[PDB]
Amino acid sequence: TYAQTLQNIPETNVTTLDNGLRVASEESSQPTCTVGVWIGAGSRYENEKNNGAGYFVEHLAFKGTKKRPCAAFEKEVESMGAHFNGYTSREQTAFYIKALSKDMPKVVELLADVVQNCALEESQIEKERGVILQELKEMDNDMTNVTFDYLHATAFQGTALARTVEGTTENIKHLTRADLASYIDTHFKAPRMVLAAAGGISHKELVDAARQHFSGVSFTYKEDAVPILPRCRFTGSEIRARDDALPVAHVALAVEGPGWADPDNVVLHVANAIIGRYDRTFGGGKHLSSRLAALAVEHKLCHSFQTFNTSYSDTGLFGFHFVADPLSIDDMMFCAQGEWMRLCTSTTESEVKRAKNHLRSAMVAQLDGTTPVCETIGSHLLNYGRRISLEEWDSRISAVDARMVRDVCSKYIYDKCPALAAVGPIEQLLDYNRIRSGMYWI
Amino acid sequence: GRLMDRIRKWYYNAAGFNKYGLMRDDTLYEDDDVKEALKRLPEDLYNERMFRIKRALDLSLKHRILPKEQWVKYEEDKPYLEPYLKEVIRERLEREAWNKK
Amino acid sequence: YKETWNTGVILLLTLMATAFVGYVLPWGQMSFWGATVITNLFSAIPYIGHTLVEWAWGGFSVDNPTLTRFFALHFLLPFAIAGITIIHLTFLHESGSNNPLGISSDSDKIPFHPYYSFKDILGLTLMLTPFLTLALFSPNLLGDPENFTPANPLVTPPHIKPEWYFLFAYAILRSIPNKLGGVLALAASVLILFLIPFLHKSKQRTMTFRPLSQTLFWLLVANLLILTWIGSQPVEHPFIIIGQMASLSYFTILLILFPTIGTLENKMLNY
Amino acid sequence: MAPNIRKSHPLLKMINNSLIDLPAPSNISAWWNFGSLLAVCLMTQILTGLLLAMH
Amino acid sequence: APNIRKSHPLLKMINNSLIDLPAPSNISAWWNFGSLLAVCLMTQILTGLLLAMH
Amino acid sequence: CPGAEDLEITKLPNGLIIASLENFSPASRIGVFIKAGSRYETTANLGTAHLLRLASPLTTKGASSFRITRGIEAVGGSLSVYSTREKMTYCVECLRDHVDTVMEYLLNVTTAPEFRPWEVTDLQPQLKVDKAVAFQSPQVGVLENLHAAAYKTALANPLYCPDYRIGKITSEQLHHFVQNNFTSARMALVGIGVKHSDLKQVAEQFLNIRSGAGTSSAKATYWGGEIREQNGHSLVHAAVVTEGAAVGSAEANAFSVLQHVLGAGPLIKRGSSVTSKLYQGVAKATTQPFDASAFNVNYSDSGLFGFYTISQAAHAGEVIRAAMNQLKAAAQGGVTEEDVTKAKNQLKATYLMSVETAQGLLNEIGSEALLSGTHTAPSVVAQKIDSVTSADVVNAAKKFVSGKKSMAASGDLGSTPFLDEL
Amino acid sequence: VHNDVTVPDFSAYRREDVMDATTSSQTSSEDRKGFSYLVTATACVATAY
Amino acid sequence: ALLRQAYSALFRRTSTFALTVVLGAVLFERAFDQGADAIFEHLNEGKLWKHIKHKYEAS
Ligand code: HEM
């Protein structure tokens, strides 16, 4: 039975190295594994002058360390069949590896070597400079991301969260070997990092290999101190980037979310499951349970739409994004906001009942493999300061009911000034005022 | 015995749409269910219905009817739509019932 | 065609109010007493009764203040009728005309002009002839001689009765001895039209192919001539009992029998 | 705009879509003649009404 | 149609001339007289009738 | 309480294979694997397999189009159909407690479709959409043309309904395709997250379209053509192959390894691939951005092997040549005993990682239970892989340089070479 | 590229309570809405009178 | 904070907002009229019949 399978899930072991680093893992019977370090750093930690540094650092992170230059490093990882990957977001960065459990220790050494000893070769930097500049022109053509960037740019205008992860064209054309070094030396530090691992690995052998390559200890009390970031102010507002030459328009709308720590996030996610998502390839078509999806199909309201509950330490974004043809934007928005009002005023037990099952499946599906189980551990620790087992999540998810979804949603959505980002042939979508009114009375 | 059958056949003739060459199903008021059913009819059945109906409208404007020989006989009336229509309604009631639960 | 229908019911009501206030203007005996009889019915409404009435009269009885406001209303309402008529046709054009066989006519449509412009012009002259014949050869056939006498509040005419087109309703009014009940009955006799769309049970639209409904239909028509006739008669035996029979059958036919027979017919078609 | 001025013009277009190119069933009978008579009847009452009102 | 403000044969009219009706963003107070003229007209008719009744 | 369970695998009298593995995961994933696909299509019914794929949600004899979707979604489940030119998998996922519920729909969809004409008619325009998003990846257009150039039949058949046939498929063709292919001897009912007895009681006391193997696909004749597509794209995608190895064939392992030796996919984000001879070779040849990999497909009665290259138009010439020279250079003993060692690992690793996924595992399991009826232990597949000499690899490479090649390219081919110029 | 785009400064227009970029704007939201809505409700009362 | 209390209790749910307008108007009328009349009479001391009435008021 489900209930039981949840209990019999191996616990996540966490132990702290005296230098401040935390080591966690979930041991499975798998011959293959994933281990990596999740860092509490990102563009939110950057300032107006080093914006993009963490991303620039992501480009070098793999081009070799001091102990072993480019060619050697790659050749050493490739030849053991290991996969080296990672990313960097607004509040979180990560570098992790997929290899056989057998190589777990050599892996840990490689990791530690990357975060601690990045070569930062002067010649390499000038090369990744042109590369990043191109990835900007490429990403500039991905409306979905251009839209979420804009959403942040305005929702959190005038703050750190208002910045893109990749940074500016200026910052990238001028960032220095120093700034990159400074960033790494300023942010990649034990107390702010977590070495997570999942697969067939002994927590012990892990931590042992940990103490060995993650030695650097702290002297002052400052070094053992995790810095609290200045809060980012949310602003109900809109940014309209219009280009009628674009084939379809993208629209994103959101209100301020509570931030990782808050339990309501469980309800918000349940809420998003009720509205859910859609795309012209969903075979379910006109019979989908999601009312917004049905209308979308019946009236050809959009090419796709998604609900999201993006969390951050002290805040977040709760909203939705859709892609529609120039002449259906207005109706889509209309029904969409309509569904939000339904959430606050007339949610049904049948809806939540189903929303919960979808959510349960979603959380489980997020632990499908070593890399994804590792991502969870790295993230949970860094954000909740511990691991929340599916058995717990389920307990919380099961306590949600209609009454609760209504109160929580009313609390975050009803009569709030939203953040709006629109890109493309958006002439038919219009007036912040009109949209603001869609924020009340079902 | 054959009472229900005597009555039906009687009503059928009293109604008189058979004098226009129409099938009982040709005379149905086109509400939503009926409209859906019609969309499911095979092409040939749909065109035959269309001609029959157009033909009846023309007789109607002329204030004539078909010669007695061409009248649809009670037992030869083909209930071509009733099958589709019953299915359309079955589906509707399923969804209605389900959306309440 | 629900909306075309409801606006229609509204047109009828407005037309009746128009003719009612119009009739008072010549200020003859039937003008005054008809005004009195009908308006006094509202003093029967609970609590707000007497108020509503003295408000309508602009005093304590039908008098000059009533006449002047009735003229204003009579001048005005016809324009509302014209207005509403536009809405009537607007809803109508959403669907287009229905037809005598009750089946879709998309397979065979013709332009309004010249077919119907001609048919209608012909229809106009065909009706217009009897109209003029009556108005020119028998001008007072339909009017009450009592209206060739100036209104006198100190002389009640023996038989206070309306123009023919209100008789059916007057009969129903008088069928319920009880000021309040009769008023509701009168009101219901016309408001009943708003329920017709909800009492359709037949699987077919028209009555062209529904012989049981057809007789029920003509029964109802005859029912109306009878009420019209009872409406013109004094309130005495046997007109009293006949009157209630007719009033009762009227409502029964529209409320109970039509929907019932329709269902019954559905079974006889094996539906 | 459009070929014939009966369809383009903001007013004639209205006159055309309700009294000329208006699609009507081919089989409507004399019973459908009463709508137009009602309208004409109404215009006539209003006309004679005004003439009486002036005296 | 999704919202009944656009589908309905009447509300649609009310919507296309008083709600979703596209208006220039820079029209001044001089454009306020059309509506005043309308309201003015409704008012004359109203007070007129009231006087006519006496 | 739960512990180590073992992968059972019965086989009913009608030939219906049932695989099963209880990993006590909070979620289950049952699936119906079938030997069917555009491979069994004839010029007469092209696209029918594709439309069938999109038709999974249509009404069935036991459940309606409406109940199939609402029903599955009510328990947070999912239902999908993945397929290749010769295998179709219908699978559903859900929490352990809902298997029995989700099972009814899976059973119904694969064994009791109704293909009502109207439903089918309204669905067909979807082939146009589905195919439109898929073709957004140039990657997909060339592979279609590759199979069309590499073969004269069966496999030459496209995976996406051809245009001219959209809207012309019939309920008869759908029914006939299903009646002649979805037969118990061609189907396997795999199922992760469940007790074998349960999954078996289902398979028997429930599945009905049965017996035999119905329509047999024509042998895969090899053509060796060259289809080019001038479409302007600043990037040219080209793929040059030769008859490779079949599945279950010993010669397989050899190619799979020559694959990793030549290089098949990067292992380091934004990183250069040194362990990739092919990549490295091309790198020394061109200066601008590009990509190159070892292409390898293994089908029932045939296979394809070669390389695939993406490059700026003007440099496709130099880039494709390079990829070639690097293949010949390998066929001429240009393979270290170490390269063979590295590869063998990357392959075993890649294999082992490609099974952490609920999807990945079920696929692996089901694939065998269908084109075999057994489960080759992981140690065995390992034993088979490293047991590949350095010679085998050099031979595989030879087979390519000598065999008749077929090429498929698309983009601004203005500077792209013809098969006879390599 | 869009990365180079940023929202101009609205300090010349922001209300006093949301002027500071490091303070949550939610804490004063019921205040800002309560005021404007109070004006509105009062107009309704003045009009109803 | 009255503005917040007001918002939460009165202006948030459209139903209570209307209730506030109605109850608000009832109270506004009573108050506004008393004040207006008060102002008007004070500005016209001893000129209104209300003022001189007593001189002849005596049956
Ligand atoms: C001043 C009164 C009225 C005017 C000027 C008027 C005018 C019209 C016109 C011009 C038509 C189209 C032609 C026709 O079918 O006759 C029409 C149709 C119609 N009217 Fe009226 N009408 C009036 C009153 C009413 C009333 C009282 C009702 C119903 C209680 C009504 C119900 C309808 C309906 C339902 C149609 C649809 C006809 C069809 O079946 O095709 N009308 N009316």
Ligand code: HEM
């Ligand atoms: C909807 C159309 C109208 C109807 C049904 C109608 C009906 C009547 C009726 C029944 C009378 C009494 C007739 C009598 O027996 O003497 C009347 C009188 C009168 N109507 Fe109308 N009327 C209509 C429109 C108008 C209009 C538009 C006006 C002028 C603005 C008008 C002006 C008068 C006047 C002045 C009288 C008094 C003179 C007289 O009694 O002949 N009527 N009307």
Ligand code: HEM
């Ligand atoms: C276009 C709107 C109207 C205009 C411009 C208008 C203008 C006037 C004017 C200039 C007067 C003279 C006022 C005076 O000095 O005593 C007047 C009087 C009058 N109007 Fe109107 N009027 C309008 C509409 C109406 C309507 C619709 C009615 C009623 C159906 C009406 C009924 C009267 C009456 C009864 C008087 C006479 C009493 C009086 O003089 O105060 N008016 N109107």
Ligand SMILES: CO/N=C(/C(=O)OC)c1ccccc1CO/N=C(/C)c1cccc(C(F)(F)F)c1
């Ligand atoms: C002012 O009176 N006009 C009469 C008349 O014949 O005008 C043509 C009249 C004459 C004698 C008795 C009753 C009436 C009043 O009308 N009688 C009835 C019974 C009636 C019935 C229903 C509705 C209405 C109304 F109000 F018009 F809406 C009135």
